[PDB]
Symmetry: C3
Subunit: 186 residues, 3 copies
């Protein structure tokens, strides 16, 4: 007998209005508010809040202001994580990110989605699928990543890409939808 | 002899620097500031502000923080409206939204536009065209909707779409520009 | 023997963690915070802060709230500049903008980029290329402009465009990637 949270985490249909999920989201927005309200020189305070917010963080992290998260604990980040202005991590499911990954401004990672069927959707049933980004990845400004996507090691995503399909390692990919355009040496 | 506001509402050229429009916009930003500054647990306060801001609201509304509006009163929303993080409703003209509509994060609805002619444009003459979204519509993250668009009932718009043409009911549509890709049963 | 800042400005590889650049960025975020925290009626205060922030400003400027900048002094704006809600000017290099230019909401101008090579990139070496927008240009909502782009006089960019190539004057261009679709009379 799974709870709503357990359904959510394992990619099954769940109701986000579940009391425990509502509370977790509220806590997330508290840490997120504190992070976003720090003054420019409060570097160590922001790092602390990240370590209380994210599921896991490396030795070095550098995240620019306004972040948006839903849960926090589903975001797992490797060494030397960098995210620029105003990224959003809609982390209904795991958002797993490797080492030496860097997000330009306005990168959006969406793990949540809904039934295409209107009636099923209106009943409030909802889903997630995790996102996985490998090591040594650079994601350009305004990139949107959809649920269930994995991006391989050693990838560069061009600005404004909408990633609807998995991206194999050692490539440069751009576009809406995002397509590989070039291979890179390992 | 129409006022600037009357010209604006009916899709005619108008000057946004009109004194009355300037004041209405200022009031809008006041409510909008208050909404955006509420703490995470202030659910009822946010709902109240929405009811003071929007032209009309249903019994249930759920709008996530940072909203951007220009007027407020031009936004008319049906039952069970949901908008996620950081949507923007540039409501120079009517933005009419049906029942059971849900916006993912960063959905942008732009009703304002300008003359293509540089000289006419520089004179400050400006336009709007209303946007209409039907019942039971789900709009994905980072979608942009342009002026004068209507989206039919029972539609799903894919993440990152730029909607430049009307979308017929009972379809899934994605892309830049946004095209129907599949039909759905009613 | 160029400093890191000098390397940055002239389009050469540089380390953003240079002590002087870090401080300049912090100052920028201070002015930017003050700008973004003004109340709706504080028109003259916002204008003042812009004049302290931007490298140059014309007689008239009208910039809507939340701006994001990195340096400020690299942003050089002509007469009658208008930017709507939540634009971002990632001004690692010069962002030069002509007279009578108007940005819709969420216009993003990115001058910063990185090596495609993972090892070079991980060493922290980074680049910029300046962006130039001519006179009498109207840029639609959610447009992304990449580094080194120039946009000619008398251009209109459609909503949601990703500008990866230079745009010649007297044209309307839209799309991802952004392509000319029509010529305009001068």
């Amino acid at each position: 007998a799974m709870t709503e949270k357990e359904k959510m985490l394992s990619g099954k249909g769940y109701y986000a209005n579940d009391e425990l999920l509502v509370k977790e989201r509220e806590y997330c927005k508290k840490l997120t508010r504190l992070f976003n309200n720090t003054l420019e020189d409060e570097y160590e305070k922001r790092e602390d809040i990240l370590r209380q917010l994210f599921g896991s963080v490396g030795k070095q992290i550098n995240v620019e202001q306004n972040i948006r998260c839903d849960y926090g604990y589903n975001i797992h980040v490797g060494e030397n994580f960098f995210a620029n202005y105003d990224c959003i991590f809609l982390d209904v499911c795991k958002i797993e990110i490797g080492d030496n990954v860097m997000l330009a401004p306005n990168v959006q990672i969406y793990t949540a989605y809904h039934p295409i069927d209107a009636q099923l959707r209106n009943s409030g049933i909802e889903y997630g699928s995790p996102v996985k980004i490998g090591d040594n990845v650079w994601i350009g400004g305004g990139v949107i990543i959809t649920p269930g996507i994995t991006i391989g090691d050693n990838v560069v995503i061009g600005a404004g890409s909408v990633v609807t399909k998995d991206i194999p390692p050692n490539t440069v990919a751009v576009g809406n939808p995002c397509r590989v355009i070039k291979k890179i040496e390992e």
